[PDB]
Amino acid sequence: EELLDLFNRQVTQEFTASQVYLSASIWFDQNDWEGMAAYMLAQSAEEREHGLGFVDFANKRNIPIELQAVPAPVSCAEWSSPEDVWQSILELEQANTRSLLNLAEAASTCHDFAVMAFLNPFHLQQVNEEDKIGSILAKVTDENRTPGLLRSLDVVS
Amino acid sequence: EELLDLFNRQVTQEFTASQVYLSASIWFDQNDWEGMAAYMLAQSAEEREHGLGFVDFANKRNIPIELQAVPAPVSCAEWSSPEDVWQSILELEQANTRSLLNLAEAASTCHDFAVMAFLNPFHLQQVNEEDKIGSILAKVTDENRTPGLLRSLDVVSF
Amino acid sequence: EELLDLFNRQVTQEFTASQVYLSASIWFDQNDWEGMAAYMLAQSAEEREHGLGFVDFANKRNIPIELQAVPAPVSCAEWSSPEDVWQSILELEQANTRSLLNLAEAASTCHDFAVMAFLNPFHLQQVNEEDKIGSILAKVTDENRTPGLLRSLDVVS
Amino acid sequence: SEELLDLFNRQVTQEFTASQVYLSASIWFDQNDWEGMAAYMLAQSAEEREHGLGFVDFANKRNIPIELQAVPAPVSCAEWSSPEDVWQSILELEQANTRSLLNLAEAASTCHDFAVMAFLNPFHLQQVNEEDKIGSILAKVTDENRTPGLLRSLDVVSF
Amino acid sequence: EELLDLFNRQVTQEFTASQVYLSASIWFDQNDWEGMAAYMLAQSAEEREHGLGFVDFANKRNIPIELQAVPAPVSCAEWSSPEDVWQSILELEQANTRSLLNLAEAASTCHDFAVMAFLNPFHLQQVNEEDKIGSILAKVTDENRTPGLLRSLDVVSF
Ligand SMILES: [Fe+3]
Ligand SMILES: [Fe+3]
Ligand SMILES: [Fe+3]
Ligand SMILES: [Fe+3]
Ligand SMILES: [Fe+3]
Ligand SMILES: [Fe+3]
Ligand SMILES: [Fe+3]
Ligand SMILES: [Fe+3]
Ligand SMILES: [Fe+3]
């Protein structure tokens, strides 16, 4: 099934996202943006929890899960400012949203009511997440127009 | 209307299931499996509560309900061991699930978004119920391989 | 620097172990061993925490970290009983122990006192972990000599 | 009362000897992953040492000279190959512990040593309880070990 | 013997560091950076506590201590901005780190396991201290690129 394979790929996408966020925390910590680093660490953990929630449902529903490699994050080689990092995180959340939507489309096709119900809170959370990351990126982009200004607002926490 | 008939039938199915669970409690109690009996009795009440939830929604949404007979459970006559009981209960939940999924299909066909929304927690509850029942059944089947060992699932656990 | 390369590989090893524990949880859950599944799930989280610890230390000490792929867990495909799973986990912990000891050796050669100090609690944790896993494996191997009896370990402990 | 003073001194040795045999049993059980039985033996080891300390305290107070002897190496641990073997040795140890205290009380009685006899009473009653408890466990172990793996239940649950 | 010398020098280095931090507080206070001043004063007290810890250990281990002069701080004659102060304090911690590592190599050579164990928490504290000072210096150097902005760090953090 399309639905089985896609359900597995969703697990992989959550854990990939978790590792991309961790990469982002490392870039931030290495460049002394400790606040932004903490934010990314927290998000890394929450994406892994999403992945675990998908594994749990799959196990219950007898959807076979085979854990795939979690690829090495690559965007961290090109980041040179906070803006770059937040833009890559926005793109990551857009891609997490598209993958949930593909999954839901396959479930809709299959008349898989339980899967569609399972996905609903993640659809709504993805709305919130893309909105939050978008908002931060807009703030970052504005503040960084003045030297030092952005730093003064990582310091928060 | 098909949606309406299937909504009525769903009430029947929940009450049917409640009675099959009661039947299972009886067989266990009669055979001194008081733990498994308690589990079945609790599930009997819960099934009945599901029925009642369907009745309440129906009443709100002006879906006419006419209570049907609650058929007599038939599988107890055959049961010989706890394995046979838990297997019949798994089959009952699998049928509870197919019934909900058919009602959801009818609702989808009719664009009845309210009914589809109302069913969603039931869809997810059935996933959990089939998993839990399947798990117990696997334990029962394994433990019963050694004489008397299953009598420790009951007394210890449950 | 061997030291810096080994410190990076230790992060990958912690995350690899996290994913192998998750694969153990899955096999247990799929096979209705919910007790053992939960044990594996918890140990998965803890191994990730260890990896996070090494990342944080590295950031503070200016050891550059580049996240590597976390390879797909392999042992899963061939597990057939709980004994097989627990045996693979013991072998993982034994490997986890050797990796830390090799890192410590490289640190000792370099006179890297800070890294040696950082590693001390992990050395002692591994002793505890290998002991605990070996002890569960011995119980599983003994109990599984009687059909169904091991299904008792799970339900109780 | 040279006999008495002697046997009292040696009773300290006997308690500490028993403490070490319990410790040995704890080690055998830990090394073989019976952590439940191991903990029980470790606790009994501490308690036998306390009994010895009680004998020493009483002797100091009653001007009975104490000279601490070597505590012999435990040797039953070489032969042990199952829990049954361990618990049988521990039963034998307690039965020996009881005989040693009765011989001490016999010597006190002969000497009209009312204080020592009073001091020993709670110990005579404790040994009754200890031999019963150990005998009961050994009976359980012996029965459960008739089915492979089943004794691992005793450990994991109880203890 | 060299361990004994290096262990006395370590006490000296901690007290010398204490005084340098005190100098940094004075410079900040005089220049109305009261937040940075209080941070430096806190670090001054803490470096003195570390020296006292070394003294206590030495007394216990019969390592004879003879207290050396605390030299007059001199970096404070040349500081013109907060960045210059923080840079000096980074160099200070880097030298405190070096002195601990020298001492640990000497204990290692002598197989002095007690000394090496005593040092372990200090090795890890120095990693944290250099990281923290490094991070503050990065923030100061960035924020000082806009006139007046660094006054924001002083009031907000610290
Ligand atoms: Fe996600
Ligand atoms: Fe996301
Ligand atoms: Fe139901
Ligand atoms: Fe680990
Ligand atoms: Fe581990
Ligand atoms: Fe005793
Ligand atoms: Fe005794
Ligand atoms: Fe210091
Ligand atoms: Fe310092």
Which H, E and C letters describe E94-148, residue by residue?
Answer: HHHHHHHHHHHHHHHHCCCHHHHHHHHHHHHHHHHHHHHHHHHHHHHHHHCCCCC
**Neighbouring residues of D3: CB distance < 8 A, sequence distance ≥ 6:** D107, D110, D111
Let me know if chains B and E touch, i.e. at least 3 Cβ pairs under 8 angstroms: no
Which residue does chain A place closest to C62, by CA atoms?
Answer: A30
Q: Give the burial class of C124: count Cβ atoms within 10 A of its Cβ; 0-12 exposed, 13-18 middle, 19 or more buried.
A: exposed
Which residue type, as a one-letter code, is found at position E85? V
User: What does the alpha-carbon distance between residue D57 and residue D51 come to, in Å, rounded to a whole number?
Assistant: 10
Q: How far apart are CA E9 and CA E61, in angstroms?
A: 16
Is the separation of the CB atoms in C133 and C89 below 8 Å? yes
Q: For residues E119 and E107, is the Cβ–Cβ distance under 8 A?
A: yes
State the residue for tokens 């798990």. B135
Q: CA-to-CA distance for E90 and E17, rounded, in angstroms? A: 11
Give the integer Cα–Cα distance in Å for C51 and D92: 51
Task: Identify the CA nearest to C151 among candidates C21, C34, C41.
Answer: C34
CB-CB neighbors (< 8 A) of C151 in chain B = 139, 142-143
Do A and D have ≥3 inter-chain CB pairs under 8 A?
Answer: no
Measure C156 CA to nearest chain D CA, in Å. 8
Q: What is the DSSP letter of B61?
A: T
* Residue D130 DSSP label: H
Q: Say whether D156 and C134 touch across the interface (CB within 8 A).
A: no
Q: Is residue A13 within 8 Å of A21, Cβ to Cβ?
A: no
To 10 degrees, the CA torsion angle through C89, C95, C99, C104? 90
Instruction: Please choose, from the candidates B71, B89, B70, the residue with its C-alpha nearest in 3D space to the C-alpha of residue B28.
Output: B89
H helices of D32-113, in order, are 35-62, 83-110
**Separation CA E128–CA E134 (nearest Å):** 10
C-alpha C40, offset from chain centre: 10
Q: What share of chain A is helix, strand, coil (3-state, %, to 5)?
A: 80, 0, 20
How crowded is the C-beta side of C82, counted as CA atoms within 13 Å?
31
Experimental technique used?
X-ray
Ligand 3: centre distance to CA B74 (Å)? 18
Reported as half-sphere exposure (CB side, CA atoms, 13 A), residue E18 has a value of 16
CATH number of A1-157: 1.20.1260.10
Compute CA D23 distance to the chain's CA centroid, rounded to the nearest angstrom: 10
Cis, peptide link before residue A157, omega less than 30° from 0: yes
The answer to whether the beta carbons of residues D71 and D22 sit under 8 Å apart is no
Subunits close to C (at least 3 CB pairs below 8 A): A, B, D, E
Closest CB from E123, E128, E130 relative to C113: E123
Q: What is the DSSP letter of A76?
A: G
The Cα–Cα gap between D114 and D71 comes to: 29
Structure tokens at A114: 């339980």
CB contact under 8 A, C155 and B150: no
d(CA D110, CA D149): 52
Structural Rg of chain E based on CA atoms = 17
Interatomic CA distance for residues D106 and E120, integer angstroms: 60
Cβ atoms within 10 Å of A90's Cβ, excluding its own? 17
Test E138 with A34 for CB contact under 8 angstroms.
no
Q: How many CA atoms lie within 13 A of A52 on its CB side?
A: 19
Q: Out of C139, C150, C157, name the one closest to residue D33 (CB).
A: C139
Whole-number Å distance between alpha carbons of C13 and C95: 9
Question: Which ligand sits closest to the CA of E130?
Answer: 9
Q: Which chains are adjacent to chain E, needing at least 3 Cβ pairs under 8 Å?
A: A, C
Name the DSSP letter for residue A80.
-
Could you tell me how far CA A108 lies from the centroid of its own chain?
24
Cα–Cα distance measured from residue E100 to residue E102, given in angstroms and rounded to the nearest whole number: 5
**Per-residue H/E/C for chain C:** CHHHHHHHHHHHHHHHHHHHHHHHHHHHHHCCCHHHHHHHHHHHHHHHHHHHHHHHHHHHCCCCCCCCCECCCCHHHHCCCHHHHHHHHHHHHHHHHHHHHHHHHHHHHCCCHHHHHHHHHHHHHHHHHHHHHHHHHHHHHHHCCCCCHHHHHHHCC
- Flag if A23 and C72 touch (Cβ within 8 Å): no
CATH 3.40.630.30 correct for E1-158: no
The three-class DSSP label of residue A112 is: coil
Per DSSP, the three-state class of B149 is coil
The CATH class given to the D1-159 domain equals mainly alpha
Which of C33, C70, C88 is the mutation pick for testing A, counting most A CBs within 10 A? C70
Report the C-alpha dihedral over residues D21, D24, D28, D29, rounded to 10 degrees: 70
Q: How many CA atoms lie within 13 Å of B79's alpha carbon, on the beta-carbon side? A: 22
CA–CA distance, D37 with A48 (Å, rounded to integer): 40
Distance of alpha carbon C41 from alpha carbon A52, whole angstroms? 9
B72 Cα–ligand 9 center, Å? 82
Query: CB of E40 within 8 A of CB of E28?
Result: yes
Which of left, alpha, beta for B73 (phi over 0: left; psi -120 to 50: alpha)?
beta
Residue C131 burial (CB < 10 Å; 0-12/13-18/19+)?
middle
